[PDB]
Amino acid sequence: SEFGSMNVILSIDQSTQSTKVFFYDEELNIVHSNNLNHEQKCLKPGWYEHDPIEIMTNLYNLMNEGIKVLKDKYTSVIIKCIGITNQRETVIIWDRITGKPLYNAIVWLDTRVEELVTEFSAKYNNNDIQKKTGTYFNTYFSAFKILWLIQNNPEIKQKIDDGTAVIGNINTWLIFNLTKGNCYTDVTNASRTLLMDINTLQWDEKMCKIFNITNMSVLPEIKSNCSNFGLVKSEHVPDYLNIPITGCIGDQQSACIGQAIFDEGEAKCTYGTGVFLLINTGEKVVYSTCGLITTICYKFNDNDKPKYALEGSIGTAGSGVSWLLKNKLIDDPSEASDIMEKCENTTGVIFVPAFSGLYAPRWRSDARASIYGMTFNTERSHIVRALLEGIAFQLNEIVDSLTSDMGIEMLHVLRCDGGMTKNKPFMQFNSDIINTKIEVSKYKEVTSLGAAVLAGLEVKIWDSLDSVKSLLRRSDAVFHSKMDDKKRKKKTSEWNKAVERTLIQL
Amino acid sequence: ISEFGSMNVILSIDQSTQSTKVFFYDEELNIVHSNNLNHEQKCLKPGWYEHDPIEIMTNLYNLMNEGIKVLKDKYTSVIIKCIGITNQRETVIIWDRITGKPLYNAIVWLDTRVEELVTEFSAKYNNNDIQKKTGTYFNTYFSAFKILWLIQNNPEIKQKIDDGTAVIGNINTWLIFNLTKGNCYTDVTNASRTLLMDINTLQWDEKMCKIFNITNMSVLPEIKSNCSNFGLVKSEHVPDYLNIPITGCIGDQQSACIGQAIFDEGEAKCTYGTGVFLLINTGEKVVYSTCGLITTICYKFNDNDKPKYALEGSIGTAGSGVSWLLKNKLIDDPSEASDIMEKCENTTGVIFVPAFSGLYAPRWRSDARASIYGMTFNTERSHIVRALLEGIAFQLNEIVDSLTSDMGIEMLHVLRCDGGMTKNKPFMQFNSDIINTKIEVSKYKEVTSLGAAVLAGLEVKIWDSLDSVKSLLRRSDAVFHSKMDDKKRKKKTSEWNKAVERTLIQL
Ligand SMILES: Nc1ncnc2c1ncn2[C@@H]1O[C@H](COP(=O)(O)OP(=O)(O)O)[C@@H](O)[C@H]1O
Ligand SMILES: Nc1ncnc2c1ncn2[C@@H]1O[C@H](COP(=O)(O)OP(=O)(O)O)[C@@H](O)[C@H]1O
């Protein structure tokens, strides 16, 4: 119909929970979006799988309905290019010629490989693994899952050996189906497999040896984030025939592009159910001394030195707000904002909210949630505030660890997203204790945003990264530290003591 | 009007902190009638706590006169045979011996204006010699530091003590003085709560009075035994009571031991109310505590009798931990606490050291705070509520294990329990397990007025022997025996010990 010309960028965000499509214009407004859940298959405990075909069929459905919606509004709809971003680590093995999965996707959240990680960790110098791949052995990354498949599945062992299978992360799987055969990954995804030399950006021989990948040609070419990943040829999305796929990045790194985290000492934190952090380390490979992850932030082109990052997680810290709600200590999450406005301090109350142990730098799985310093005067308010403060303290320990390893004194910025960022009193406390400028982005959808940006740069939609930079840096709330260093030292040491009581062996 | 025949009764007066109660017991110890009246709890500035001695007296006369009218409007021949007095202890009044005017309000045991003096006097004296003399260290609760404060900030009180025309009395003395229009008496149990009595010889102490500026020892009432003739009622305020004998007198906590039939060594009572505190009968042995608990007099029936002794321990306002769960929405009603301990068999590793006001005896750590340990995302209101309740039991067990170690015994004969936490049977059962004791909950709520009726009736020979009353008094309404093996007790109390360690370790 009637409304004229419309040039768009398709950004696909294939998430854990669902599949999203965003149609961006070249000013980076969302002209249209939709999404579709897929089933989160948890068979026995610790298992977590996806139907790779369900995901693909959801994707086609979304692509086809989006373009009809756009074409029913505008006169000349042009989809210029396609950006792909995705749940990392999650792995599929399939048949190179029919494209049938030889098994479901095994999601990053899956832990059936826990016993193997223990075994292989007892046998190998985890220190040499960290130098090679940027991380110790773990249950999240793809390799131990690829291994489990090789060990409990004769067909997968055999078609890996004969060279007629493909081992792919979700991006590879998306691009292979859309282009009817192309076998690619990018640097950021490749870095989440346990198979890639973190220094040379190549599939690693010794790592594959460790993991029984006997034939290295089943692994897709590692491309850079901007690159030609092929043309759409699928007959499932007829309107998209011959449209170029031109950006590809893992979700967490995509959100760094959406948050314009481009230079060293620039960092982004998500405060959702999970609370985790990425610090851009410039062109320097920094290895952590406290067990945090060395990753690839991005590499735009083949000529570029890649930019590196450091990664840290405090698990599902935002679920401590759900736990206050279960125990009636608040009635609505919004009440947490209210409480931290009214309540200036906790009157000496400290909450070490280690419900699942303490993560980096301490690494203590045996730590539990502990509240200290209460009197008859203590109220829901004080306990709720302490919990929230306990989240900030954990986060500060990670920042103080990563910044110590990087040889810097302070973060340039911490760009923040997720639902806890609606709490401004809480944002302010994080700024105080960490000693950092905190900016909350203008955009919710920083993850799809980064893939659109990458895809648009590759086809030269904008004339330079600087053109997009100032668009991307728009903040919606800004925070500077209002706490003196003497008071920071005093509080974080009261925290340290409370963590000591929590951990001392008796 | 009044046609239901003959009625012989014992009057029991319970002059409490909060109010004044009258109980008319028959000689089967049924309550034929009771009534009561609040008096004002005066908290001027912080730490201060006073009563109007006249308001109390006037409440008492009002209750006495309305009770007897009620009885006389029902019965044909009402006979009030004797009167028993029990009372809030430690609370002190100084008055004029001849007019009976108070020279100042009563200063309630709960009052702490004397805190600086206790600190001073404690820096100066061997608190160890004080304990041997009086059964306790210096404190803000007992009468002497309040009598002292009065002497120091009040020239009239200093002067009329010096010249011999004033009386220093606990609430019993005050009651008996006004009722009999002049008699000046106390009993052994009240005397023991003044800081002025030799805990061994039952005499007012010279040296202790020296310490406290009681320059003239004749202002102190004669120490009587618990059964004794305290005088006849002569007051014209209660005309119907003229010439009725006052024949029992005891401090409230010791009266409850009499009502709970706590007569032999190794027999103990615990109250689980807002406050949670314990008394263990030590037989005829004066046992001094090695952990700062109080050596007191349980009772002495007659002048010929060797007194029976007790040990006393308090965990402060532990029952208020249940109010704190309610403020923080962790339960909706105290009754939900019983429900929770039925359903919830354990706390899945969760421990609550409920030290809201610090830890009392044996540890004595004012710097301890309330602390909760061992939680995961799976922890629920139930687990925290049960942990708190279990934390109360563990504190109590430390006190029992202290007192029993000083007494040279291995186990309590019984623990007779009262208060509203005793409606929670799963909680009573856990205390029985951890402390390792038989727990009996009495048939009677009103064990405090019960004891004074018993004492008054024995004095006038209403019953033929203490054994006559004993079996009546020992009626229980619930009984608990330990269902926990000693290996599990050792494992739990040692997990508790470690949690108290984390709470207290200095960093
Ligand atoms: N006003 C608030 N104050 C503190 N925490 C909040 C507030 N609102 C939401 N949260 C927490 O934020 C998380 C939800 O944020 P979101 O980013 O949508 O989660 P997810 O990462 O699961 O998508 C939950 O942990 C929730 O309890
Ligand atoms: N079912 C119960 N479980 C646990 N505690 C209870 C229960 N019912 C009442 N309580 C507590 O008992 C105390 C009240 O008992 P009571 O002996 O009447 O108090 P007080 O000593 O103030 O007169 C309060 O601490 C109250 O919260």
Author numbering:
A (entry chain A): -4 to 501
B (entry chain B): -5 to 501
What did the publication describing this PDB structure actually write?
Each domain is constructed around a βββαβαβα core that is characteristic of the sugar kinase/Hsp70/actin superfamily of proteins. In agreement with gel filtration experiments (data not shown), PfGK is a dimer in the crystal.
The PfGK–ADP crystals have different cell parameters and it is apparent that domains I and II have moved apart and that the enzyme is in an ‘open’ conformation. The relative domain movement can be described as a 27.5° rotation, substantially larger than the 7° rotation deduced from crystal structures of orthologous enzymes. In the dimer, the long axis increases in length from 97 Å to 117 Å, exposing a further 1500 Å2 of solvent accessible surface area around the active site. In the open (ADP-bound) structure, interdomain contacts such as Gln12-Thr268 and the salt-bridges Arg83-Glu306 and Glu109-Arg363 are ruptured. Aspects of the glycerol pocket are maintained, with a pair of ethylene glycol (cryoprotectant) molecules clearly mimicking protein interactions formed by glycerol. The adenine base forms polar interactions with Asn418 and Ser332. The rather modest set of polar interactions with the ribose and phosphate groups involving Thr268, Gly313, Gly414 and Met415 are likely to be augmented in the ternary closed complex with ATP.
